[PDB]
């Protein structure tokens, strides 16, 4: 089956160079007609393609980006590399790389790398319990933490129906997040909620309970 | 550049029901060599692309026939007979006829319920971040259909717009509803120097907005 899946470095600093690395299999570059794209999706925003090469080294570039980008195959070990030159915050997106023969265009993806081009220092969330100003419905609000990304749970897992945790929002290079939990007012606060925080790059693990204001 | 200008944005459709997608791009797709590069894809949240259509209107090995496409030089449409829960995500139409290729910013295909108000609740700041020197006041919406809505933060009755932060969750599998969070960061000093705090909901299930508010000292 044809599979692809690309590699690199997680997080860059600004003025840094991005390496990619797009590993397949299931087809070659020695191929007549074969090629392979490279594409990136910032979150949320519109995909935009950046380079492609072809079995023969014919080598196609986004005209804006040329001059920071460079394509290139290692045929005989199934790899396609991609090199981004002097990134900045604007090159944070999933990295995708898609096989490309001449008449199918981008015809199979792989599943994406993520890179994160930040001057930002690994900061740990500040986790806040969220209680009330039939049913009710309690939060914990995750602030200012870097890099993502940070797993939420409510009572160790065992709380998971009636939970809304929503995706990170970036302000002044700091994530935050919110999550909400509703259970019937019988529930809470006789029985303990407690949201569960982790941020496996600060090595950090944080348990807040919520109690009655 | 060659752009795609894809509409509609968002298709609300009931399972069964015929979809369809237009892509207009700004030049002929039809290249020198007589082919139109004009291809459709299908991409789920945290999954990538999917090729469904090559070519205007060749189907991709697997794609089944309920899919087809059409059109010629700068028109083209995709359209989805018979939608199932598994098509729902989003459509994008990408050419490949002129360098730099290009695509069009997609077409969210979702599944229409019932209309639902949010239920909305509003938090003062914890007493731990005040403690730390900050003051976020949340407010959620959840569980509401359509997912069009728009929340007015309001201090001592006068709208504040900066320092607002909102997350959108999607459709929900299970309830087809959508929930939003907003919250508003102040400084400890300027919450310290306001009384009143509200979250103003503006949703199509009422004419006037649903309102959550709190006083500092109350």
């Known amino acids: 089956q044809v599979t692809l899946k690309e590699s690199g470095p997680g997080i860059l600093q600004p003025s840094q160079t991005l390496s990619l690395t797009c590993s397949f299999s299931?087809?070659?570059?020695?191929?007549?007609?074969?090629?392979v794209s490279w594409i990136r999706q910032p979150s949320g925003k519109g995909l935009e393609w950046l380079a492609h090469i072809y079995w023969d080294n014919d080598r196609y570039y986004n005209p804006s980006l040329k001059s920071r980008l460079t394509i290139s195959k290692d045929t005989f070990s199934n790899q396609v590399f991609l090199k981004i030159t002097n990134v900045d915050t604007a090159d944070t997106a999933t990295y995708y790389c898609?096989?490309?023969?001449?008449?199918?265009?981008?015809?199979?993806w792989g599943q994406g790398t993520s890179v994160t081009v930040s001057s930002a220092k690994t900061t740990a969330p500040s986790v806040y319990p969220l209680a009330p100003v039939s049913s009710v419905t309690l939060g914990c609000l995750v602030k200012g933490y870097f890099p993502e990304p940070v797993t939420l749970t409510w009572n160790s897992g065992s709380l998971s129906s009636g939970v809304h945790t929503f995706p990170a929002v970036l302000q002044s290079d700091l994530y935050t997040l919110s999550s909400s939990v509703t259970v019937t007012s019988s529930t809470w606060p006789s029985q303990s909620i407690t949201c569960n925080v982790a941020h496996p790059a600060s090595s950090t693990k944080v348990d807040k309970k919520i109690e009655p204001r | 550049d060659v752009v795609m200008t894809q509409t509609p944005l968002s298709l609300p459709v009931s399972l069964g029901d015929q979809a369809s997608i237009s892509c207009r791009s700004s030049?002929?797709?039809?290249?020198?060599?007589?082919?139109?590069?004009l291809h459709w894809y299908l991409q789920k949240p945290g999954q990538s692309p999917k090729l469904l259509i090559y070519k205007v209107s060749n189907r991709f090995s697997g794609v089944p026939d309920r899919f087809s496409g059409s059109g010629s030089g700068t028109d083209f449409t995709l359209k989805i007979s018979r939608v199932e829960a598994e098509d729902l995500g989003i459509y994008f139409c990408?050419?490949?006829?002129?360098?730099?290729?290009?695509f069009g910013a997609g077409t969210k295909l979702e599944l229409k319920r019932a209309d639902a108000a949010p239920t909305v609740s509003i938090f003062p700041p914890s007493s731990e971040q005040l403690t730390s020197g900050g003051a976020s006041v949340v407010c959620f919406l959840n569980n509401f259909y359509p997912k069009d809505i728009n929340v007015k933060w309001k201090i001592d009755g006068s709208e504040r717009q900066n320092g607002v932060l909102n997350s959108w969750t999607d459709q929900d599998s299970k309830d087809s509803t959508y929930s939003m969070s907003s919250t508003l960061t102040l400084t400890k000093d300027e919450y310290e120097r306001h009384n009143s705090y509200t979250c103003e909901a503006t949703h199509k299930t009422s004419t006037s907005p649903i309102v959550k508010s709190f006083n500092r000292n109350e």
């Open positions: 990408s050419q490949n006829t002129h360098v730099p290729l290009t």
């Open positions: 030049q002929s797709l039809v290249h020198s060599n007589g082919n139109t590069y």
């Open positions: 299931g087809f070659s570059l020695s191929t007549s007609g074969m090629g």
């Open positions: 898609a096989r490309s023969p001449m008449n199918t265009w981008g015809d199979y």
